[PDB]
Amino acid sequence: DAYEFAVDVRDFSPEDIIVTTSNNHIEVRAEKLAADGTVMNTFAHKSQLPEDVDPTSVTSALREDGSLTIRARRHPHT
Protein backbone atom coordinates (compact mmCIF):
# COMPACT_ATOMS: atom_id res chain seq x y z
CA ASP A 1 0.00 0.00 0.00
CA ALA A 2 1.06 3.60 -0.69
CA TYR A 3 0.42 7.00 0.89
CA GLU A 4 -1.11 9.76 -1.24
CA PHE A 5 -2.74 13.16 -0.79
CA ALA A 6 -4.08 15.76 -3.21
CA VAL A 7 -3.17 19.42 -3.73
CA ASP A 8 -5.16 22.16 -5.45
CA VAL A 9 -2.96 23.63 -8.20
CA ARG A 10 -5.76 24.69 -10.51
CA ASP A 11 -4.73 28.30 -11.29
CA PHE A 12 -0.98 27.69 -11.75
CA SER A 13 1.55 26.79 -14.43
CA PRO A 14 3.54 23.52 -14.29
CA GLU A 15 6.82 25.45 -14.43
CA ASP A 16 6.05 27.22 -11.13
CA ILE A 17 4.77 24.09 -9.35
CA ILE A 18 7.54 22.74 -7.11
CA VAL A 19 7.81 19.63 -4.93
CA THR A 20 10.46 19.74 -2.19
CA THR A 21 11.08 16.74 0.06
CA SER A 22 13.39 15.78 2.91
CA ASN A 23 13.75 13.08 5.56
CA ASN A 24 10.18 13.44 6.83
CA HIS A 25 8.32 16.23 5.00
CA ILE A 26 7.00 16.95 1.52
CA GLU A 27 6.48 20.57 0.46
CA VAL A 28 4.35 21.39 -2.58
CA ARG A 29 4.55 25.03 -3.63
CA ALA A 30 3.43 27.06 -6.62
CA GLU A 31 3.00 30.69 -7.60
CA LYS A 32 1.18 32.37 -10.49
CA LEU A 33 2.69 35.56 -11.91
CA ALA A 34 0.92 38.34 -13.79
CA ALA A 35 1.71 39.77 -17.23
CA ASP A 36 4.62 41.84 -15.91
CA GLY A 37 5.73 39.06 -13.57
CA THR A 38 4.68 40.09 -10.07
CA VAL A 39 3.43 37.40 -7.70
CA MET A 40 -0.38 37.65 -7.60
CA ASN A 41 -1.03 34.20 -6.11
CA THR A 42 0.96 31.60 -4.18
CA PHE A 43 0.51 28.80 -1.66
CA ALA A 44 2.61 26.25 0.22
CA HIS A 45 1.39 22.79 1.25
CA LYS A 46 3.95 21.27 3.64
CA SER A 47 3.18 17.75 4.83
CA GLN A 48 4.73 15.72 7.67
CA LEU A 49 5.16 12.16 6.46
CA PRO A 50 4.69 9.19 8.80
CA GLU A 51 7.82 7.37 9.92
CA ASP A 52 7.21 4.37 7.64
CA VAL A 53 6.88 6.41 4.43
CA ASP A 54 10.06 6.50 2.35
CA PRO A 55 10.64 10.14 1.29
CA THR A 56 12.82 9.07 -1.66
CA SER A 57 9.95 7.23 -3.41
CA VAL A 58 7.73 10.28 -3.95
CA THR A 59 6.14 10.41 -7.40
CA SER A 60 3.87 13.23 -8.55
CA ALA A 61 1.17 13.29 -11.23
CA LEU A 62 -0.63 16.39 -12.46
CA ARG A 63 -4.06 15.69 -13.94
CA GLU A 64 -6.38 17.53 -16.31
CA ASP A 65 -8.83 18.64 -13.59
CA GLY A 66 -6.19 20.84 -11.96
CA SER A 67 -5.36 18.56 -9.02
CA LEU A 68 -1.85 17.42 -8.09
CA THR A 69 -1.45 13.91 -6.66
CA ILE A 70 1.55 13.26 -4.40
CA ARG A 71 2.36 9.58 -3.89
CA ALA A 72 4.95 7.75 -1.78
CA ARG A 73 5.26 4.08 -0.90
CA ARG A 74 5.54 2.91 2.71
CA HIS A 75 7.30 -0.10 4.20
CA PRO A 76 4.94 -1.07 7.06
CA HIS A 77 6.29 -2.90 10.08
CA THR A 78 6.36 -6.70 10.00
Numbering used by the authors: 85 to 162
Per the authors:
Given the nature of the heterodimer between HSPB7ACD and FLNCd24 as composed of two well-structured units interacting with nanomolar affinity, we considered them a strong candidate for co-crystallisation. The asymmetric unit comprised a single heterodimer, with the interface centred around a parallel pairing of FLNCd24 strand C with HSPB7ACDC131S β4, and the donation of sidechains from each strand into an adjacent hydrophobic groove on each monomer (β4-β8 groove on HSPB7ACD, and C-D groove on FLNCd24). Note that this is a different site and mode of association to that observed in the dimerisation of sHSP ACDs, which occurs via anti-parallel pairing of β6 + 7 strands. Specifically, the HSPB7 β4-β8 groove accepts M2667 and M2669 from FLNC, while the groove between strands C and D accepts I102. The interface is thus mainly comprised of hydrophobic contacts made between the monomers’ sidechains, with additional stability conferred by polar contacts between the chains. This allowed us to obtain dissociation constants (KD) for the FLNCd24:HSPB7ΔN heterodimer as 6.7 ± 1.4 nM and FLNCd24:HSPB7ACD heterodimer as 3.9 ± 0.9 nM, significantly tighter binding than we measured for the FLNCd24 homodimer (75.9 ± 8.4 nM), by >6 kJmol-1 (see later). This also shows that the C131S mutation that we introduced to aid crystallisation, but was absent in the construct used in HDX-MS, does not alter the location of the dimer interface.
Though it shares the common architecture of sHSPs (an α-crystallin domain, ACD, flanked by N- and C-terminal regions), HSPB7 is unusual as it has been observed to be oligomerisation incompetent. FLNC interacts with HSPB7, also known as cardiovascular heat-shock protein (cvHSP), via d2417–20.
